[PDB]
Amino acid sequence: KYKTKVPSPVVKCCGATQCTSKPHPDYQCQVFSGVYPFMYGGAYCFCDTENTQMSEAYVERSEECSIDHAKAYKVHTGTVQAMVNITYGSVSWRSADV
């Protein structure tokens, strides 16, 4: 099972930026316009049209992947072997593999 993580996005009180593609598994990034965001008791990081948003996304393996995980295999004939218990004449039970 996978898991998606997201770094903290970046905004600006004015102007705009552009996001770049990085070499990551199913990397994503995009920009949005006219945010006028909000914060706790804050000035809300805006005075005008914001047009700043990063919202990048990121995919990687889960932390529990170490335990449960399917595996695929290719199969060919391989060997054959067994074990045998033996007794003859008066000798007792003797066992060995072959």
Partner: protein, 98 residues
């Protein structure tokens, strides 16, 4: 396959490449609140976990179980075996003593 059985395929146990997709998609945040919405297909590994068919150890013909570690297919009874054994000559006795 966008989450059917392969959506996170690490070539090894601790590789650094995952050559599969999850159909990730982003969304536009609303109401000026700092968050990063998104959407994606649910993991197909879970789906295959829910709909696994009959395990092999309940369909193998000829009545033979399946160990794990060497992929042993034990006791699978079939056919015959050509045997050839030699005993020491010290275990015989003269025909006139019986």
């Amino acid at each position: 396959k966008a989450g059917s059985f392969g959506d996170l395929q690490s070539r090894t146990s601790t590789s650094n490449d995952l050559y599969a997709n999850t159909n990730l998609k982003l969304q536009r945040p609303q109401a000026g609140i700092v968050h990063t919405p998104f959407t994606q297909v649910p993991s197909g590994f879970e789906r295959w976990k829910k709909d696994k068919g009959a395990p092999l150890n309940d369909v193998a013909p000829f009545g033979c179980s399946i160990a794990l570690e060497p992929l042993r297919a034990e006791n699978c009874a079939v056919g015959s075996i050509p045997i050839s054994i030699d005993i020491p000559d010290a275990a015989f006795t003269r025909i006139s003593e019986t």
